[PDB]
Design a protein around this ligand. Structure first.
Ligand SMILES: Nc1ncnc2c1ncn2[C@@H]1O[C@H](COP(=O)(O)OP(=O)(O)OP(=O)(O)O)[C@@H](O)[C@H]1O
Ligand SMILES: [Mg+2]
Lengths: 75, 1004
């Protein structure tokens, strides 16, 4: 939503990562689904900025790890 | 009940209104201590300047009435009985609440009640010097709430004129002036109104509420209510209250409420009077030890400004600090630098940075504060400067307060963001204007118009090129000349004249001239150290060598020094210019020539030609005699590196770089002449000291080239000689500083153990405003104001994404997708000036103007390199999954065709790169793995609806997912791709059919 903050997206990605932790990533996957992304596009909070790192590795400042790379669909 | 109690006590005690609730809690706790905190004493200073423990102790006497101790003792005796009389917890709590409002010291003996604090503050105020007696200008009435309505630019000067009426009275502070903002809380306005109307004060001060229009509706309403209420009660019948608003916003609540009071004679003063007033108040007496002594007229505040970058602001501050260390005879003079990076000034960061200095040791010691307002800052600057420089204060509601001490010097480094009044606000301040070289020659000593710094003019960097050029222009003999270290010749004017003449730029900054001089100095040093200039060792075979060296190096500098850029005025190309490079190898015996050939002409001279086109680049670089002599020395002229073997290329490269071993770390990287020139350029810049900022599309080869160079220099040693940081919009300044410091430590370690230099690389730096911090690292050679450690072996590289705009058709597709954008391009705040960011191909912010002259194009990715990278990727796939040659050919040709079609389709795709091909190959691989099972299901599924090569099938579905789906004109893509598929698969219809059958199989 226009009021969604970066922390919401970060916590969503982190939760998907916690789900992927400890499992075989060739048989299990966790996906992040964002609904109504366009609403956040030009909000003053600019949450979508976080997407670039989180899509690449799954971490903004944390060190890379396999379980942090989750799937993603934005609708 | 507590709120009523606080309001009543605030009416009974005047000085409590100087502070808020949390500030009062802080003071109540601290003052009982021995000694109080320096913060508390600073907070009190706004009532009694230079408040000390002795002042608080003297003020405490009398306020501690014995009647208060009687009340305390009585309540301490009574409360046990009162609480025993009531049984419910809620009644006990109510009793406690009442008794706490009656006598708090009985409960909290370590804290002052509001009454004792009020008395102490009043005693402090009365111990002070003379009261402030101010007079209102003509047109403004005492006892009446006056209102002024003006243009934004006039708001601040007008308030200043109000106080100008009494130029002998001290400048005001937060007590007298409040600058309103949308975030301004009701507590601040309420305390201002209480200070104006309430009694208890000793003088007729003036109270101003500026930019009132910005106040929120709720705050303005509450302020009006409080104002009227105060006027109903026993109040000051001679109060002087002024509101100032922006005429454009006059329609809002506060300007409307007081429209009747509107005054039509707007106060104003000439710029000269404001200048003299501020200068007088800033002037520090002779007896007070202060930093100001170095400044022009003992002014404790000063501005350093320029019309463009690289003109000596930071240098001026450095020279000022040195002069202060020399003149003041003090063992040390602390220097604090503060960098303002955020577009909206964050006063809390500045306050946090300054707070460490509140300690008493600094209160009577020369200290210099340097505030750098980078180009990133766009808003909040004039308010901040008004508050700190004029109102002498900074504050957060948290309670901590900074007061500007006259024993300290404050210098602001800013670029003149002039865009309307008759003068800019900065002009009111004492200002130093730094000029570029050409203005320095033309207009010219003064202390506000600095010219050529004498330490630089006497440096090797300027002197060696200066002496060489001085002899060169007069055609004097250079064969015998030799620069003696420390020698000095000529004057600053002739040095500037020669540099500007040969520089190549018309109106250069000082940084550009420094980079030119540094380059020519480095290469002339290498020339002097070579054997061709050693004690004779040649007889006289090399007549004119230095003349040629000077001419050619003056030409070569054109590439490194000259800009490469000319709202979106930022682009130029790399292939548009020749890259003739000459290097003096560390062996002092050989030279390397790249990027050009030497051709003898009929004129008896030798000309420079392009190795590719053969066209003349520059004529008369040398005479034929020198050319023959250099050939007799076996100098590699007219070499064609493109035809040489791989190992010969590697050897020439390692020799020129100074590497001893040609250990090939990557046989796949193609060592073409262009890549070798690019490497040699980055090397030269690392060597001479010029920052490296590159501009290029993604996938053009920056990362691979840097990795190849790092590996080649590493020589197989197990060390992390390179750190790559991928910058993004979320990359803050702290992340950059931490990465730089970690890289500096790693570089020191690598240099100590393995004697290896370290590279730090920032990719997509422009994506964030923190890019301005990267400027500090590259040009200023500092980190958060702290200087970098030289000789650590750390080199920094930055890559900038290009500034491109989507086509209009593509922008239409974007604006038309779905229900359209939630915000219109006009209302957007995410914009690069006039252009919204969503219309850009890369989300990039503006470059700091100091970096603009340094950026150079890395070059576009040619079709041949694209095809070769595709071939490498397909071959890796072949090895991984056992493909044949036919499939390899088909995949390569089809991926090339897809990239070409998407590049041509400017109405649907603006961004094309090699990463997409990796993505598509990944999809192909996945389809191949499952291809066995999925096709079986397909055969079953299709049997319900009553032969395929897994490779071409997986290719079809990969193309479908990666390219076919994103497109709208799918038919053209399928038509183009079909040509490359073997028969009978060379039909767009069959591709669509197979994609559809797969989609069906998946829905089943
Ligand atoms: N007379 C001179 N005036 C200014 N700079 C000089 C002079 N002589 C040599 N220089 C060189 O020019 C460079 C000027 O850098 P400076 O710190 O002035 O940039 P700046 O004014 O802070 O620009 P920006 O704030 O945009 O970075 C210095 O590195 C210095 O070595
Ligand atoms: Mg500077």
């Amino acid at each position: 939503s226009p009021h969604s903050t970066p922390q919401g997206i970060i916590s969503t990605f982190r939760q998907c990562a916690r789900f992927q932790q400890g499992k075989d990533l060739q048989q299990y996957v966790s996906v992040v689904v964002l609904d109504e992304v366009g609403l956040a596009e030009d909000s003053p909070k600019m949450p979508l900025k976080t997407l670039h790192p989180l899509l690449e590795d799954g971490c903004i400042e944390d060190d890379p790890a396999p379980h942090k790379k989750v799937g993603f669909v934005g609708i | 009940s507590w709120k009523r109690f606080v309001t009543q006590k605030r009416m009974e005690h005047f000085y409590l209104n100087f502070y808020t609730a949390e500030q009062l809690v802080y003071l109540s706790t601290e003052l009982r201590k021995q000694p109080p905190s320096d913060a508390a004493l600073t907070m009190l200073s706004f009532i009694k300047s230079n408040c000390t423990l002795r002042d608080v102790l003297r003020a405490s006497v009398g306020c501690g009435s014995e009647a208060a101790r009687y009340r305390m003792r009585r309540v301490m005796e009574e409360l046990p009985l009162m609480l025993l009389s009531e049984f419910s917890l809620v009644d006990k709590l109510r009793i406690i609440m009442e008794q706490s409002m009656r006598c708090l010291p009985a409960f909290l003996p370590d804290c002052l009640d509001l009454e004792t604090l009020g008395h102490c503050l009043a005693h402090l105020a009365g111990m002070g010097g003379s009261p402030v007696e101010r007079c209102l200008p003509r047109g403004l009435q005492v006892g009446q709430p006056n209102l002024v309505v003006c243009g934004h630019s006039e708001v601040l000067p007008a308030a200043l004129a109000v106080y100008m009426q009494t130029p002998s009275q001290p400048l005001p502070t937060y007590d007298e002036v409040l600058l309103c903002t949308p975030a301004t809380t009701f507590e601040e306005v309420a305390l201002l109104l209480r200070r104006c109307l309430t009694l208890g004060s000793l003088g007729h001060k003036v109270y101003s509420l500026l930019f009132a229009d910005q106040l929120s509706y709720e705050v303005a309403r509450q302020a009006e209510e409080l104002f009227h209420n105060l006027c109903t009660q026993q109040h000051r019948e001679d109060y002087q209250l002024v509101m100032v608003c922006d005429g454009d916003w006059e329609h809002c609540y506060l300007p409307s409420a007081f429209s009747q009071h509107k005054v039509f004679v707007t106060p104003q003063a000439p710029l000269e009077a404001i200048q003299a007033y501020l200068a007088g108040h800033y002037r520090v007496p002779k007896q007070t030890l202060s930093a100001a002594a170095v400044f022009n007229d003992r002014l404790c505040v000063g501005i350093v400004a320029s019309e463009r970058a690289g003109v000596g602001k930071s240098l001026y501050v450095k020279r000022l600090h040195d002069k202060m260390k020399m003149q003041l005879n003090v063992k040390n003079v602390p220097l604090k630098t503060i960098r303002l990076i955020d577009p909206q000034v964050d006063e809390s960061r500045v306050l946090g940075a300054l707070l460490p200095f509140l300690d008493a040791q600094y209160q009577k010691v020369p200290v210099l504060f340097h505030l750098d307002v980078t180009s990133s800052v766009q808003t909040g600057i004039w308010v901040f400067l008004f508050k700190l420089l004029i109102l002498q204060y900074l504050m957060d509601i948290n309670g901590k307060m900074w007061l500007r001490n006259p024993c300290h010097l404050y210098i602001v480094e800013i670029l003149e963001r002039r865009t309307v009044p008759q003068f800019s606000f900065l002009d009111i301040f004492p200002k130093v204007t730094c000029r570029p070289p050409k203005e320095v020659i033309d207009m010219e000593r003064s202390d506000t118009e600095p010219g050529m710094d004498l330490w630089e003019f006497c440096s090797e960097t300027f002197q060696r090129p200066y002496q060489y050029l001085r002899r060169f222009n007069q055609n004097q003999d250079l064969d015998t000349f030799q620069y003696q270290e420390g020698s000095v010749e000529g004057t600053p004017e002739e040095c500037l004249q020669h540099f500007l003449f040969h520089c190549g730029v018309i109106n250069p900054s000082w940084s550009e001239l420094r980079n030119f001089a540094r380059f020519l100095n480095y290469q002339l040093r290498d020339c002097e150290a070579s054997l061709f200039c050693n004690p004779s060792f040649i007889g006289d075979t090399l007549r004119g060598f230095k003349k040629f060296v000077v001419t050619f190096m003056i030409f070569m500098a054109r590439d490194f020094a000259t800009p490469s850029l000319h709202p979106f005025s930022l682009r130029k190309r790399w292939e548009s210019e020749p890259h003739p490079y000459v290097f003096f190898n560390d062996d002092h015996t050989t030279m390397t020539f790249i990027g050009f050939h030497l051709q003898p002409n009929i004129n008896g001279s030798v000309d420079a030609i392009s190795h590719l086109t053969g066209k003349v680049i520059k004529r008369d670089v040398m005479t034929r005699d020198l050319y023959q002599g250099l050939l007799l020395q076996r100098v590699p002229f007219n070499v064609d590196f493109d035809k040489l073997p791989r190992h010969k290329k590697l050897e020439r490269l390692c020799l020129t770089l100074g590497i001893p071993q040609a250990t090939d770390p990557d046989k796949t990287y193609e060592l073409t002449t262009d890549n070798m020139l690019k490497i040699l350029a980055i090397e030269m810049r690392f060597r001479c000291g010029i920052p490296v900022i590159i501009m290029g599309e993604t996938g053009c080869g920056k990362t691979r080239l840097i990795k190849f160079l790092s590996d080649l220099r590493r020589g197989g040693t197990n060390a992390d000689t390179i750190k790559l940081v991928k910058v993004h919009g979320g990359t803050t300044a702290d992340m950059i500083y931490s990465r730089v410091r970690e890289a500096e430590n790693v570089a020191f370690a690598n240099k100590d153990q393995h004697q290896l230099d370290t590279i730090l690389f920032f990719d997509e730096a422009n994506t964030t405003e923190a890019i301005s911090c990267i400027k500090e690292v590259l040009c200023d050679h500092m980190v958060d104001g702290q200087p970098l450690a030289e000789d650590s072996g750390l080199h920094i590289i930055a890559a900038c994404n290009p500034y491109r705009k989507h086509s209009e058709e593509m922008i239409c597709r974007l604006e038309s997708a779905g229900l359209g954008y939630r915000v219109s391009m006009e209302e957007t705040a995410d914009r690069l000036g006039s252009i919204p960011l969503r219309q850009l191909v890369y989300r990039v912010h503006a470059l700091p103007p100091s970096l603009i002259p340094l950026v150079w194009d890395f070059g576009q990715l040619s079709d041949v390199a694209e095809k070769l990278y595709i071939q490498q990727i397909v071959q890796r796939l072949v090895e991984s999954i056992s493909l044949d040659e036919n499939g390899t050919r088909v995949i390569t040709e089809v991926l090339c065709a897809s990239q070409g079609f998407m590049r041509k389709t400017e109405d649907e795709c603006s961004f094309v790169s090699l990463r997409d091909v990796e993505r598509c190959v990944k999809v192909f691989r996945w389809f191949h793995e499952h291809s066995a099972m999925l096709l079986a299901q397909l055969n079953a599924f299709l049997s319900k609806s009553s032969e395929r090569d897994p490779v071409l099938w997986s290719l079809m579905l990969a193309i479908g997912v990666c390219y076919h789906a994103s497109l709208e004109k799918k038919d053209s893509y399928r038509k183009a791709i079909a040509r490359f598929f073997p028969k009978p698969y060379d039909d767009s219809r069959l591709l669509l059919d197979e994609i559809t059958r797969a989609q069906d199989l998946f829905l089943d």
